[model samples]
Target chain A: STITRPIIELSNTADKIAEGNLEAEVPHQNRADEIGILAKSIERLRRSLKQLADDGTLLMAGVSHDLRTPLTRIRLATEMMSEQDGYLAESINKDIEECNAIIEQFIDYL
Target chain B: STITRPIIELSNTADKIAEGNLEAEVPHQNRADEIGILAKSIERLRRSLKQLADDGTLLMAGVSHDLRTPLTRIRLATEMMSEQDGYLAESINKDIEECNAIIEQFIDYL
Candidate 1:
């Protein structure tokens, strides 16, 4: 009965971990057996997944910063365009806005 | 011994799943006990993770399509600019290229 209880706990803890709750600790980590090895492996998985999520966030921040420079140049260039080409400039501006929206979507997806 | 074997199998399957191998199937799924519930839960996790990966790929494709329109407009606008404004056009073109590079990085991250 005691052994079964630990297995149940491991299952619940794993479920929590899979749901992005890396705080869930595997029980019976003191055991010198297969279950202990499993516990340790799951802990490693949690750490790796957390690192991946953090990397994604940092990458997005870097992308946002890098994108801004080009976006500003596009805005300034359109401004310097001929007055008679106002329609073309407006269309280009719209394109720039669309690019921004797509970038936002990428951030959200991450 | 039979029960321990099943538990070992479950742990191994879990290791595979955590490593992004969704093909791992939990043994003892027919058991009318805690292990059975765990097997089903893991199956659900595998499906959910697979769905998330697929959704990410699809979103990237959609973002790519949406991005290309703006890139094309930027290219066309630079072409329409006068000869004297060549310097500004070149800078804007470089910005557009940078935007494209950033987008590629985003996709690669995904």
Candidate 2:
């Protein structure tokens, strides 16, 4: 009866994790048995995913900051172009627009 | 005895999946029991991941193709710029380079 209860608890916790709950806690972690080993492994996986999420957030902030420099340069270049070369300036502006679009897609992927 | 064998096989298959081997096959899929349900669930998960991977590959290919248009525009604009606007051209060129670096980071995230 005790073994069945622990196994069921582990199964429920795993189901929660599968449903995208990385915060799910495995029960019976102190038991020195196969189920306990499995619980420990699941806990390790949850921690790994939590760490990755944290890293992703920090990386996104850094990338957003880095994007601003190029954006500033593109804006200044567009302003400096001569009236006669407006077409070239417009094309460059379009390039920057597309670049921003790609960056948005990149952020979505992250 | 038979139940124990099926449970052991399912456990082993789960272990393989945990080790990143989604190709691992459950040995008792035909059994109409709790273990069979588990096997089917695992199979569904494997299929979902496979589909996601395929979608990722196609999305990347599409994104790469989309990126080429802006690249072509930037290149042509750089070529058409007047010699007097050398500084502007250089700045635009640097922007494109940084944009490329960000794209590389985006790919790595993918």
Candidate 3:
């Protein structure tokens, strides 16, 4: 099982990690042999994936914040329109709701 | 080179695919042995990544389309605001600009 066992473990770990279980750790990377080389390569893949997921989360958060500003302003502006000339207020409100829905779909991307 | 060569090929292919050269394909999956098994596992990883990148692209396209509608309305509605009621026109224009910036940043995520 010298060769087969380690290959199986690395294979499983790689699969799990690729499937978004970034918490899975790859073993056999420390061996001074061919398995070690393969394991190390797979480990790099895992690290890359972890970084990717982290970057997406951060960007998603930023997007949510940036959108919140304009959405808030649009809603408030529409609310204030009733006190003044309100011709476009209702139409703008519809736009705002659609915008809100767009953001929800975006967040669901994460 | 039976064991060492295939392992090396798989490892290298895995690394490249992980690094986003997803056009690269995994080989050595037909053997009825341990190498074949590991190759199959890594192939699954490759497929998952490809599907992931595809999903992101599709969603990004959808988001772009969804956003264009509201943004266009806001710009036009604001433009028309100046024809009569100009109190909120300038402020809404600024919000529109910022919202455009947000969409650009989102698109750059691809």
Candidate 4:
């Protein structure tokens, strides 16, 4: 597809902005028409959304960002375990591999 | 006020629903006029939002949820340090006091 993630992000952001997350700010770009207006709305929404969580949007962003620390640590430990030798390492690695696969699957599912 | 926070929340949620956040759902209850229609719209929106989220919105939820990790840590760390005593704690406490003041000011500004 010609469309990039940013474009999609902008689209979603615009929808949220139009939905009245007045604090939503879409970065300035060359896109035209509805998108431009939507982007403008986003710029406005960004300010308002900052003032209020707008239901769970802020919670979603804040909470998800904060949740990554432990998840990252777990990932790192798994990576480390995968590098070691013997049955203990093998079992750990297998478990870690499964976890990694699950994460990938989960991400795709999302 | 007859317009409780829920009413306000519902109003805001309706705006989002109209703007096409289609997943925007306000709790079901007895209300009249535009509010009743908005509630019905929300019920429909819930189904659409769920399909979108289940298939594609997972990324939004996952990414949003993930970001909260560090924020929670900082809150916990601040709380823990606030409980300790002695010179180290005193310095930490001063820093935290400043932080608290800044936070209150910021929240008010918002």
User: Which lDDT value does model 1 have at A20?
Assistant: 68
Tens digits of per-residue lDDT for model 2 on A13-81?
A: 656655556577767778876555555655554454454445544654555567668767887897898
Encode model 4's per-residue lDDT on A1-110: one tens digit a residue: 22334435664554554454544456544555333443444443344333343333343333324333434443343333322222332343344344335434543542
Candidate 2 local lDDT, B8-95, one digit each (tens): 5555666665555646675666757655554554454444443444454455555556776886688778888888887888888888
State the C-alpha lDDT per candidate. Answer: 0.71, 0.63, 0.76, 0.41
Q: Candidate 3: list runs displaced more than 4 Å.
A: A83-97, B51-62, B72-86, B89-94, B105-110
Residues A47-69, candidate 1: write the lDDT tens digits: 54555555555665666777888
Candidate that scores best on DockQ: 3
Ranking by DockQ: 3, 1, 2, 4
DockQ score for model 4, please? Answer: 0.05
The DockQ-based CAPRI class assigned to model 2 is acceptable
For residues B11-107, what per-residue lDDT tens digits would candidate 1 score against the true structure?
6776786687756676667889877866665565555455554554465456667778888888898888777677777888998888788777766
Residue B35 displacement in candidate 1 (angstroms) = 0.6
TM-score ranking, best first: 3, 1, 2, 4
> What is the Å distance of residue A34 in model 4 from its true position?
27
Q: List clashing residue pairs in candidate 2.
A: none
- DockQ for each model: 0.37, 0.31, 0.49, 0.05
lDDT of 1 at B96: 85
**What is the C-alpha local distance difference test score of candidate 2?**
0.63
Off by over 4 Å in 1: A3-6, A22-28, A31-38, A55-65, A82-90, B20-22, B48-63, B76-90, B101-110
- Would you list the clashing residue pairs of candidate 3? none
